[PDB]
Design a protein around this motif. Sequence first.
Motif, PDB file in Angstrom:
ATOM      1  N   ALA A 145       9.611 -20.554  -5.671  1.00 22.04           N
ATOM      2  CA  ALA A 145       9.920 -19.177  -5.745  1.00 22.04           C
ATOM      3  C   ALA A 145       9.462 -18.367  -6.491  1.00 22.04           C
ATOM      4  N   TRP A 146       9.743 -16.817  -6.202  1.00 17.13           N
ATOM      5  CA  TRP A 146       9.272 -15.888  -7.073  1.00 17.13           C
ATOM      6  C   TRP A 146      10.199 -14.620  -6.617  1.00 17.13           C
ATOM      7  N   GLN A 147      10.666 -13.812  -7.606  1.00 18.13           N
ATOM      8  CA  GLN A 147      11.208 -12.487  -7.572  1.00 18.13           C
ATOM      9  C   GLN A 147      10.966 -11.439  -8.511  1.00 18.13           C
ATOM     10  N   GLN A 148      11.167 -10.296  -8.196  1.00 21.65           N
ATOM     11  CA  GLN A 148      10.760  -9.271  -9.207  1.00 21.65           C
ATOM     12  C   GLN A 148      11.900  -8.216  -9.192  1.00 21.65           C
ATOM     13  N   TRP A 149      12.032  -7.505 -10.460  1.00 22.95           N
ATOM     14  CA  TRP A 149      12.839  -6.415 -10.668  1.00 22.95           C
ATOM     15  C   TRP A 149      11.970  -5.227 -11.251  1.00 22.95           C
ATOM     16  N   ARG A 150      12.701  -4.145 -11.178  1.00 18.34           N
ATOM     17  CA  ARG A 150      12.129  -2.969 -12.076  1.00 18.34           C
ATOM     18  C   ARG A 150      13.017  -2.628 -13.212  1.00 18.34           C
ATOM     19  N   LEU A 151      12.354  -2.608 -14.138  1.00 19.71           N
ATOM     20  CA  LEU A 151      12.846  -2.582 -15.571  1.00 19.71           C
ATOM     21  C   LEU A 151      12.858  -0.941 -15.874  1.00 19.71           C
ATOM     22  N   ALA A 152      12.992  -0.540 -17.165  1.00 22.15           N
ATOM     23  CA  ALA A 152      13.101   0.498 -17.660  1.00 22.15           C
ATOM     24  C   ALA A 152      11.668   1.531 -17.280  1.00 22.15           C
ATOM     25  N   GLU A 153      11.861   2.652 -16.637  1.00 23.55           N
ATOM     26  CA  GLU A 153      10.790   3.405 -16.276  1.00 23.55           C
ATOM     27  C   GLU A 153      10.629   4.582 -17.173  1.00 23.55           C
ATOM     28  N   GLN A 204      -1.247  -9.909  -0.301  1.00 23.63           N
ATOM     29  CA  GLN A 204      -0.998  -9.972   1.358  1.00 23.63           C
ATOM     30  C   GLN A 204      -0.663  -8.839   1.895  1.00 23.63           C
ATOM     31  N   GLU A 205      -0.817  -8.633   3.221  1.00 17.30           N
ATOM     32  CA  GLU A 205      -0.437  -7.201   3.847  1.00 17.30           C
ATOM     33  C   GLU A 205       1.094  -7.565   3.852  1.00 17.30           C
ATOM     34  N   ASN A 206       1.684  -6.072   3.999  1.00 17.80           N
ATOM     35  CA  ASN A 206       3.258  -5.831   4.121  1.00 17.80           C
ATOM     36  C   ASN A 206       3.429  -4.682   4.831  1.00 17.80           C
ATOM     37  N   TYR A 207       4.623  -4.522   5.191  1.00 20.94           N
ATOM     38  CA  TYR A 207       5.079  -3.504   6.231  1.00 20.94           C
ATOM     39  C   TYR A 207       6.695  -2.882   5.506  1.00 20.94           C
ATOM     40  N   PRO A 208       6.842  -1.794   5.976  1.00 21.91           N
ATOM     41  CA  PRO A 208       8.342  -1.467   5.651  1.00 21.91           C
ATOM     42  C   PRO A 208       9.332  -2.541   5.542  1.00 21.91           C
ATOM     43  N   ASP A 209       9.394  -2.848   7.098  1.00 23.96           N
ATOM     44  CA  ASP A 209      10.405  -3.664   7.291  1.00 23.96           C
ATOM     45  C   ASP A 209      10.139  -5.426   6.833  1.00 23.96           C
ATOM     46  N   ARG A 210       9.120  -5.544   6.447  1.00 26.25           N
ATOM     47  CA  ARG A 210       8.742  -6.924   5.907  1.00 26.25           C
ATOM     48  C   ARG A 210       7.872  -6.717   4.558  1.00 26.25           C
ATOM     49  N   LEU A 211       8.436  -5.812   3.692  1.00 27.90           N
ATOM     50  CA  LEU A 211       7.949  -6.061   2.403  1.00 27.90           C
ATOM     51  C   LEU A 211       8.771  -6.650   1.358  1.00 27.90           C
ATOM     52  N   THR A 212       9.503  -7.339   1.805  1.00 36.16           N
ATOM     53  CA  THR A 212      10.144  -8.390   0.765  1.00 36.16           C
ATOM     54  C   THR A 212       9.491  -9.374   0.110  1.00 36.16           C
ATOM     55  N   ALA A 213       8.416  -9.931   0.703  1.00 33.25           N
ATOM     56  CA  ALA A 213       7.750 -10.980   0.223  1.00 33.25           C
ATOM     57  C   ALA A 213       6.333 -10.439  -0.623  1.00 33.25           C
ATOM     58  N   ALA A 214       6.156  -8.869  -0.497  1.00 38.31           N
ATOM     59  CA  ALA A 214       5.176  -8.333  -1.190  1.00 38.31           C
ATOM     60  C   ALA A 214       5.611  -8.074  -2.732  1.00 38.31           C
ATOM     61  N   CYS A 215       4.635  -8.093  -3.720  1.00 38.86           N
ATOM     62  CA  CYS A 215       4.643  -8.069  -5.144  1.00 38.86           C
ATOM     63  C   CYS A 215       3.970  -7.232  -5.741  1.00 38.86           C
TER      64      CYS A 215
END
Lengths: 996, 996
Positions: free
Chosen positions: A701-709, A885-896
């Motif tokens: 599993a993997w996941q991402q967050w946006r920190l301070a910008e 890998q390729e991604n789409y607006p409705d399928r960008l969840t797996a994109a990193c």
Amino acid sequence: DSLAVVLQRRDWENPGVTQLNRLAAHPPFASWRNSEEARTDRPSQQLRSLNGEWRFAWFPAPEAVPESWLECDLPEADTVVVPSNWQMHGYDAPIYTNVTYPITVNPPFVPTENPTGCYSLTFNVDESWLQEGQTRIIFDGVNSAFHLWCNGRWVGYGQDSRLPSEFDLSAFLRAGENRLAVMVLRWSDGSYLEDQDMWRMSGIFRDVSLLHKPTTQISDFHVATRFNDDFSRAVLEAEVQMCGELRDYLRVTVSLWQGETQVASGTAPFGYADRVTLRLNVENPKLWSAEIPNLYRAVVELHTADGTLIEAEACDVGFREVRIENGLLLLNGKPLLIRGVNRHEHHPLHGQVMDEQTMVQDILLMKQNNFNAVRCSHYPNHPLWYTLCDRYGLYVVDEANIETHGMVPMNRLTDDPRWLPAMSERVTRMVQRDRNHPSVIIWSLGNESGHGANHDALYRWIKSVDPSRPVQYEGGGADTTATDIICPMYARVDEDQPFPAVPKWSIKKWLSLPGETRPLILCEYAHAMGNSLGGFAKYWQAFRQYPRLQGGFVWDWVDQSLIKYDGNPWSAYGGDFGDTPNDRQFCMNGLVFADRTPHPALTEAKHQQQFFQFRLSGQTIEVTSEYLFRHSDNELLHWMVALDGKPLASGEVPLDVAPQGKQLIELPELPQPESAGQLWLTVRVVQPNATAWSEAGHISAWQQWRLAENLSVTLPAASHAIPHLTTSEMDFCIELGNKRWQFNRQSGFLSQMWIGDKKQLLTPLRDQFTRAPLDNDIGVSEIDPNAWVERWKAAGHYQAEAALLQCTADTLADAVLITTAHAWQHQGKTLFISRKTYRIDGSGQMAITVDVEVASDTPHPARIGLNCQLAQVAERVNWLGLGPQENYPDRLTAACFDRWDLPLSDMYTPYVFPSENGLRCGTRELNYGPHQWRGDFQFNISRYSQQQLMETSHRHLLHAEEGTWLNIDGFHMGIGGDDSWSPSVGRYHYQLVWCQ
Amino acid sequence: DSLAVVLQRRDWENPGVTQLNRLAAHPPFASWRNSEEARTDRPSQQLRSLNGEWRFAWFPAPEAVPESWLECDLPEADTVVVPSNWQMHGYDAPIYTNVTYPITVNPPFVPTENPTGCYSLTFNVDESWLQEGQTRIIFDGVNSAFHLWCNGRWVGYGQDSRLPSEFDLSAFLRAGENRLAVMVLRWSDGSYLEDQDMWRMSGIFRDVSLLHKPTTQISDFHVATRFNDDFSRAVLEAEVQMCGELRDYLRVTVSLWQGETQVASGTAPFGYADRVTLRLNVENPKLWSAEIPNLYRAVVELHTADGTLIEAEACDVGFREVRIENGLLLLNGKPLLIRGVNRHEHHPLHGQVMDEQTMVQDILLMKQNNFNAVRCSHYPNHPLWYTLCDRYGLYVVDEANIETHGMVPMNRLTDDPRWLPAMSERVTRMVQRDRNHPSVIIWSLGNESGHGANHDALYRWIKSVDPSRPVQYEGGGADTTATDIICPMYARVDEDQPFPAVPKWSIKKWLSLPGETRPLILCEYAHAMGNSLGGFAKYWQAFRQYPRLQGGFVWDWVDQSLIKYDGNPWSAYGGDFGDTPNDRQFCMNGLVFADRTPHPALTEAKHQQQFFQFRLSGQTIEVTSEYLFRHSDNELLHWMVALDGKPLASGEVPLDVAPQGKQLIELPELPQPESAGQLWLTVRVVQPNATAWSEAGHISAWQQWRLAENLSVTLPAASHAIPHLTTSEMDFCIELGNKRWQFNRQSGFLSQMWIGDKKQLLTPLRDQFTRAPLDNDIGVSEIDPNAWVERWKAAGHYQAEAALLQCTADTLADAVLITTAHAWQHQGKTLFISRKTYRIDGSGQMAITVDVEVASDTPHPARIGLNCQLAQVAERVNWLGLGPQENYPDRLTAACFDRWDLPLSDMYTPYVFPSENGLRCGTRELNYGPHQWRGDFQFNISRYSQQQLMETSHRHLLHAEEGTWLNIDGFHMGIGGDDSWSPSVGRYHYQLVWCQ
């Protein structure tokens, strides 16, 4: 024994005859004469396989077969391997159909032109098997209905291809040297219930075996299990039956071996005079679940009073409980989360012949992506498949081979009580054969076969025979009394689809129906048609929120593509073999290719099905495990910190979280740089130790967050250069050193740009409002008015013509300003209007602001962005954004989000049906050759134009166009993916920066 | 078409084949081409009956039939009528079996010696039926499995004897002049499910018909009904299907005719494209119940668009509701009281051939005795039986032809899923054929056939197809999930019979079982074996007390006796035809004889099943009617007052009581005579007007009470006569005028008594402790230790020898006193001791006081009383007591106290198996010829001794002994009658007065 006598009855055209002298169904047996060989699963000499080289002849009709067959092999008969199919050997073209019957709709009559596979084999038999004992043949599968002749003598007749058929042959076998004759028919009465959305295909597609048993033998035995409240104490019911002469000295023994060590045992004589009940108490049993495939090797012995062993049989037995209460499917006292998949039985080079290597590899790939549920679609699978499923850990939902979708109405057959014999055979034989296995949890009576009375009868029969398993059935609205587990097809999450008598509620509404308490699992959902698997997240969000919604089965696993030779193999679909009617590319819905190369959709499914969900609260991280029985003792978190791609800090924290528990991970003092940009926190759970189905270092599993910008700070545009744009009547020419840009004044588009001498643009920079045909858009069009591509064509978006306007501006203090607008009209109606602004500073950076308005009455445009064909052909593409890998607006969840670099070949996915693909969204910076574009956009880069993608139907027909094609889009709609026969998906502005 | 080809498959020995090219089941049709003929039930010319003289040949095996049959009739072929049975025509002996299979127990194999009835007929066909249309043959019954050849051409194969079998013959019929060939087998696979406790018998036992239909025809139609809360508003669902080519101009019309007047109608075109739904609203419908057989003639028309009629079909439809709630069976919103009966299909001179005259007469007799429920045992009956049942008013409980009692264990077959095809055929064909009739209320899946999984499946199928009827099934303890109406067999009222896995609770305990809410009706109860029907009252008391106990079915109606010629016809049972194994007289359980002469048990059943219960409170009478819908508008009470037989006062009060209501009848000032004796109040309810099933003045109910009793007053014994008893060594001689009594001093019994010269006693007056064998006593002995007759034999009561004692006294002042005692010992153990006292006064009246003691350890003696053989042979017997029909202590409820006089022939009932009978209890005064006995006793008078009754097995073998036999008993046990295989039933004194 003659054909002219046998075929005259036309038993294949009679729904009341399903078997002739066929022996009783039973769990697969090996007839072990030694307890150690029975326990250790060593091969049994009593089970002689007969797979090899046989003799085959083809005929267009059963009557066309001459009587010279049954005495000797025909001179024109070829030498084919068994199990294998004559359809692939070019004797006739297989046909794929979805709804319409490939044969004429007139049950039980079948077309006179019935292909006949004339399979035969000459073989020897040991006299040791002949002087005593019973010798029976077992056909693990014969599609679809067949007769049988042994040594020129008629033995019987059979049906029910997807299930094993066995007959007694001791009374036609003698003098070893012998000949077996089998005639098979492509069409029969059962084909009306055999209307799978699969390749209509025939032959002997499963193993043919020869089993020898003594006169007294073990007939049937069912091994059930019950538990106490805490599962610490359980008892095993190894009910056993036998046949033949009954002697008081006969004894049976059921021994339970946890590996090489025996745990529990029991013995008892007979007394039903042929049935004996044994109950074996087990303490602290190692329970069975998809996470932990604990196996008990229970051996049933038919032994003499003095102790000599006559026959020994064994079956792997797991300890688990599956039951329904309060609207939740409980497995070992815990709720289930079915991340299923519909594994169609298909092989790229053997049709529906399945072997252990392919089966094991499919199980490995399926377990490597958090798939813990399988639904054999739509038929019982190979007998070893279930054994491997118990061994590895995989809940299976067996499906009886019943399908009559094309019949009008759907339940015209499943309500006529003349088909109760055939349906009861096809259901009860499956149940009896596959009851013992612990992996099989849910019996399914069929896929939408229409809800009559036969389904109620068979559901009650199953619930009376094996009450340890819930029974699901999708037909008749999936909410009838013939169903314990409500399983609708393609029921959308929030949108409601109220069809007459078979409506598709939103799943939450279906949950909230009055008087409804049964749990809901989605029979089919998330069609994986190429670049699809859309709404998955939405779906998984609903699955995780709602307790009584327990997941679905992503359709489907393997791509049903047959290899065609031009000699270059190219994947083909229905209609490429000359078959008609067909269903084109609708047979291409696999998460992996036929040769098991992972599709891009596999990665998205893996991400969305992860067992670990993460929540971020300041510095600490909340880790929650979806496992219910196992502890995360083989995981190690890897967190990393990156600022716009470059890593800054990282660390590893081993994971120790209880099942359904929580673990809080306290991060160190994360860096807080003053540099402009967005800080990102990426956490990856890695399995350092290789498991039975994974390699060392497996990513779970993997996941991402946006920190301070930190807002972009310094960015001074231009140096000191007032450009004297060459104003000419035909174009505006702007030159800055060796760089030159040409703007045509008649089209209003960037015609050519120069880097010194070499040209850069093979196609002028223009806006693209269109994307290639999409399976979802197409829906069921070929014309469907509601299809998205059809609506776009009617609106003329594909044929809208850009009309140039003016607003052309001039130079400024340190730059040159160009302002233009265009009008795209289809038959006089303005569809879109966009106003562009081009800004080339003294540093060469070109900023293009485009503001786009869209008419409300027209359908939503496919895409908003710029298209061109670059002259540069680089070997790799570099970008900072979501990927790789390729991604789409409705399928960008797996994109990193990260700085990714891929070769240009990887920039296009090898979908057999060409379409819009290779898209990478959320790209803040792009690099390709000398140029670079920055901002916040989505793009795809490929050697094929959208026009060629639309025109070309097969991937292998695609030809590499000169240069490189770029489609940088500010915005794009989703691709949908809820279903493939209906839609499943005003004023805008984008800012782009062009640099080098 | 040859036999050597057809019979080689041995389809009769294959459970998976139940029909070959057999058409679909359907309600019986006539194919009316005119609406008026359809409505008025006039005969339809399209339905040509084929009953007549055929050609038959017998063979011991199917292979023994030469091939010369199929071309022409054999020279040895006889001319038999159809429908009829070859078993009765002497070709083979029918065999009756109860439990043991008449054939070898080895399913599906049947004995090689399989009798074959070679039925054939040559017939002509009109060309009008041949140039167009479809012509089909319908076999209403062929036992048990048959093939079919038309004009030397094979047509198909059939099974399921008890249900109609039809095939399409338009494709084998041509040129009118033609031959039909039918081969029938006594044994087949279905015989394993055809193990009725009936005569194993075969042939074509039902009508053979020929039906012609047009190419487009009406296929099937189900007419259901639903009601509102108050039954005032109801709607009719005449769902209809058709077949053939579908034309837009085709129309259907459903018209509802209440007699000659049309009430509701509707029309609709097709559109299933072959099914059309019509709903017809009905107001204030005339509901249907056993009391009121209201009939609606609904006509379904297949008519053209312009209106010309193609085909019209009709079926009688009644408006009723049958449903289960709160544990009560509601019929039209009211609870039911099932006074059922198991009508076996049997005919004295035609075997199982049934005709309209016998059917109508059986219905008449059944309705004349308050029987309002029938259970066809155990198979669907003749199609016209249900029509007559609707027309007259009689709830029927249809029973699917499933019986496998002899198989070990019971459910070895009904759990194997290989017999699901056969069981499903035998159930679903019955359901489809008999759904429309309103009389059929409860579908029954069989009688104790063992509870497997097939019964659960079929129960759920029935509840899915026709949810308007509860489904009962008795097997597996009669309380499984495969049963809505708990129906145990022979569950006793208070005694408990806890058998393993099939216990027989007391019915009240079964009602009070935990978690049990379904109603209870007794599947079989009250075996009517000759002089039996015992405990009926007890049973009816429980039925009336307990609301959720809803009656039973008295087994059985008609006596299954075949006529045998010695040429005098004598009723015979199993084993009298040379058949072995058999079950003797167990086939003789009818409330009426085979020729419908009423048994004595019929009167007792009629009394116990009356609809009117009466309570006496001083002078008024409380009358309560058990009717629920009808008012007692055809009744007239007749009350009478009698003092020791002589009537004193009487009157008639017309009855007007609401259903389930009460009516109080105030009697006039009843006479209060001062004469000694008991006043009796007898009330009789008489139906003055003849009904559809009864004659004018029909008696419906009667009951009696004891009024004020005046103790006997004056009775001075003797006048003035001191008798000088001649004291001699061998006897005591006492003479009073012309009368003389002799008392032997060596035996201690009255040897001879004189009236002048003529002798009176042919057998000396002795005590009798024994009664002839009783079916109940016998139980299942032939030796059963618990059988009552076996216990009596072991105790030696039948062989106890009287040992004389003394106590002999002498004369008194006006009389002579004799006091004696005897000891009856069997192998030295004194069983009984009785001390007698004989008192002859001066008036000739002889008073005999006997005091009897019995040893506790011995079983209870059969009877206590005196036996002798009188010399007088009078033509009539007169008595004052309970009668006029015979009665017993446990079955004296129907007996009425009055002065009865009957001929000596009526004093003995013609039971085929001789036993103790002719008993009349509660006889306060007896008259026979010159003698008369007074007191309070029970007696029987007949020309046959108890020894001859015991020895003789058949009635026709009985021979009239000289003189007359008398058995005046002070006491007697009951006869029982709960069951016929187990028992179902110390110091005493009686006073008798002998006079002339």
